[PDB]
């Protein structure tokens, strides 16, 4: 396999992503440098097979029944359909540039694919019966990184990570309508790597960074150049956009990427790729902070470098480059995919 963006060959799989079957018996790891997907049994923690897909898979989504795995092949500009029981790819559907993420509708009748190409704005829809790409939903700006579907399945959020932009936004889509209802801007943001929904569907979490671009590059202290943040957006009309710090004064979480939401909405799990660790936060303290604060107070609290300690549950040691995380349906275990270490860290959560 090839290292991404290069013609240099490597024997290492380089896991870029991870997910789990809705019955929680199987983990599917997308190997970016392996051009395949690794199957792992949850109970035995054993590799049960490796299924070949197209070039550079960065993402995968499982059907509600768990008979199929839709893998995003980024370099191939395509999406592979994998038979989970047969351990074989049965089709390749062609999509827009660089799918970086994919998710299946609650009814399992539709798959949504975010095309992350820098000049590309698209979310391609795919019927599961036809196993084919129906149409494309054009976003408000370029580079959707990932999508997410609400628990009621009538709405689709898409993080737009837009190159050359200080203000990067999130699009709200009406699934039945298939068009953009609203666009909400996260001010002073860059590198949006994920978006998740709360189980009640009243909030979304988005991991990103806050650059200070208008300032001289002088020191590294007090986040003069970059700070690392998680933003909670209230899904109601006119809802708050709350940018919250992930960093201590002398301790920062470099490049937050993947997110896993507790099934009951108790905790938030964040893969920290630069600092090689999983940051676990208390979501009732976070949401409690959001509900009890105005927009002004939250905007002031974004730069509070002692604030995290209020809602911070833990920071757990991981392998190198934990780009993605996922949870078991009972929420008692969190898995983190490590690219450089070529492995998966298994974490016992606070849930008992």
Partner 1 sequence: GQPRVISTIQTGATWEPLGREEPLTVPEVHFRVKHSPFKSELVRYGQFQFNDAAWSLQGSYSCASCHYERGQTTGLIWDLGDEGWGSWKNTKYIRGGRYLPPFRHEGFTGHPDEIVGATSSLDRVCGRDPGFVFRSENFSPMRLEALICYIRALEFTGSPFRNADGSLTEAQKRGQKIFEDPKVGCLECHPGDPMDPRALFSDAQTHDVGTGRVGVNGFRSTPGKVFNISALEAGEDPYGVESNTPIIGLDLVKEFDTPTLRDIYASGTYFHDGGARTLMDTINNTVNDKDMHGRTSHLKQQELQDLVEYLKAL
Partner 2 sequence: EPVMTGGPVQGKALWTDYSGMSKEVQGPVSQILFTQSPRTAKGDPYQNYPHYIPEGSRIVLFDLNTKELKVLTNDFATAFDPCTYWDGKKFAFAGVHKKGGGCQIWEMNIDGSGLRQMTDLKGTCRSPIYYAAGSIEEGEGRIIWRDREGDWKEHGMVEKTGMIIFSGSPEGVMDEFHNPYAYNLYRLDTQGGKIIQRITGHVLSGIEFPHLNTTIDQITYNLSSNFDPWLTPDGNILFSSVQANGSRAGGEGRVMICVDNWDGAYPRPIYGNCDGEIGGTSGRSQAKITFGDRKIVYVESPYMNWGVGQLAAVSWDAPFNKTYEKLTGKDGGLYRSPYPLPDDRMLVSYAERGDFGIYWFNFSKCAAGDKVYDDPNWNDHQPAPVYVKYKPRWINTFTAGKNFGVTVVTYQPFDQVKVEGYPHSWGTWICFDTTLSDQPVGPYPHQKAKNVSHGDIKAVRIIQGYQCVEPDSTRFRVGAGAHLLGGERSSSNSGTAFQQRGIIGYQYVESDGSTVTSQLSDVPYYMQILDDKGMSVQTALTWAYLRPYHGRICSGCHYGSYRGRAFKNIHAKALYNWWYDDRSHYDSPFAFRYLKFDNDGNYKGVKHGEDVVGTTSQPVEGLTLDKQRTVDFRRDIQPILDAKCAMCHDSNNPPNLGGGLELVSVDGIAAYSRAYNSLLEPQRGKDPNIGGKYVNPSAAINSLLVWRLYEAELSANAPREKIFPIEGRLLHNKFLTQDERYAIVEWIDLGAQWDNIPGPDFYPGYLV
* Alpha-carbon span 344 to 341, nearest angstrom: 8
DSSP assignment, residue 221? Answer: G
Cβ closest to partner 1, residue 156 vs residue 160: 160
Min CB(9)–partner 2 separation in Å = 23
245 binds, options Ca ion, Mg ion, partner 1, none, Cβ within 5 to 8 A by partner type:
none
User: Looking at 41-49, 134-142, 216-224, 323-331, which segment touches Mg ion (CB under 5 A)?
Assistant: 216-224
Cβ closest to partner 1, residue 219 vs residue 296: 219
Mask 290-319, x = binds partner 2 (CB under 8 A)? ------------xxxxx-xxx------xxx
User: Looking at 94-102, 141-149, 281-289, 306-314, which segment touches Ca ion (CB under 5 A)?
Assistant: 94-102
Which of 81, 76, 70, 78 shows the shortest CA–CA distance to 105? 70
Rg (CA), the chain: 19
Min CB(213)–partner 2 separation in Å = 7
Min CB(296)–Ca ion separation in Å = 33
* Alpha-carbon span 319 to 10, nearest angstrom: 19
309 binds, options partner 1, partner 2, Mg ion, none, Cβ within 5 to 8 A by partner type:
partner 2
Min CB(117)–Ca ion separation in Å = 6
209 binds, options Ca ion, partner 1, Mg ion, none, Cβ within 5 to 8 A by partner type:
partner 1
Min CB(326)–partner 1 separation in Å = 13
97 binds, options Mg ion, partner 2, Ca ion, none, Cβ within 5 to 8 A by partner type:
Ca ion
Min CB(345)–partner 1 separation in Å = 5
Sorted by sequence, the CB contacts under 8 Å of residue 293 that are 6+ apart come out as: 242, 301
Q: What residue ranges in 6-108 does DSSP mark as E strands?
A: 15-20, 26-31, 36-41, 46-52, 57-62, 68-73, 78-83, 88-94, 99-104
- 224 lines the binding site for partner 2 (CB under 8 A): yes
Cβ-contact 62, 20 below 8 angstroms: yes
* Alpha-carbon span 330 to 322, nearest angstrom: 22
- 216 lines the binding site for Mg ion (CB under 5 A): no
- 77 lines the binding site for Ca ion (CB under 5 A): yes
Supply angle C-alpha 160, 325, 272, rounded to 5: 75
- 50 lines the binding site for partner 2 (CB under 8 A): no
Which of 132, 138, 60 shows the shortest CA–CA distance to 102? 60
């Amino acid at each position: 396999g090839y290292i991404q963006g290069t013609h240099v060959k490597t024997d290492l799989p380089g896991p870029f992503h991870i997910t789990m079957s809705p019955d929680g018996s199987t983990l599917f790891i997308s190997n970016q440098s392996g051009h395949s997907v690794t199957f792992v049994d949850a109970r035995t923690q054993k590799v049960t097979g490796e299924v070949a897909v197209r070039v550079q898979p960065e993402a995968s989504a499982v059907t509600p029944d768990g008979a199929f795995l839709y893998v995003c092949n980024a370099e191939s500009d395509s999406v592979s359909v994998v038979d989970i029981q047969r351990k074989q790819e049965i089709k390749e559907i062609k999509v827009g540039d660089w799918p970086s993420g994919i998710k299946i509708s609650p009814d399992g009748k539709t798959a949504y694919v975010a095309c992350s190409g820098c000049m590309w704005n698209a979310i391609d829809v795919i019927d599961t019966g036809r196993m084919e790409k129906v149409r494309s939903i054009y976003t408000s700006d370029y580079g959707p990184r990932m999508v997410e579907i609400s628990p009621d399945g009538k709405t689709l959020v898409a993080i737009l990570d837009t190159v050359g932009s200080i203000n990067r936004s999130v699009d709200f889509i009406d699934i039945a309508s298939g068009r953009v209802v609203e666009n909400r801007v996260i001010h002073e943001s860059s590198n949006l790597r994920d978006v998740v929904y709360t189980p009640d569907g009243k909030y979304i979490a988005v991991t990103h960074q806050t650059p200070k671009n208008w300032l001289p590059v002088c020191e590294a202290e007090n986040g003069q150049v970059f700070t690392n943040n998680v933003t909670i957006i209230e899904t109601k009309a006119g809802g708050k956009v709350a940018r919250l710090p992930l960093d201590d004064l002398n301790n920062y979480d470099g490049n937050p990427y993947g997110m896993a939401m507790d099934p009951k909405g108790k905790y938030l799990y964040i893969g920290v790729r630069g600092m090689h660790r999983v940051t676990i936060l208390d979501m009732d303290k976070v949401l409690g902070l959001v509900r009890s604060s105005t927009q002004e107070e939250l905007d002031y609290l974004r730069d509070d470098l002692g604030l995290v300690r209020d809602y911070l549950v833990a920071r757990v040691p991981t392998g190198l480059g934990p780009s993605s995380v996922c949870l078991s349906p009972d929420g008692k275990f969190c898995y983190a995919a490590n690219y450089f270490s070529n492995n998966v860290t298994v974490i016992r959560t606070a849930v008992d």
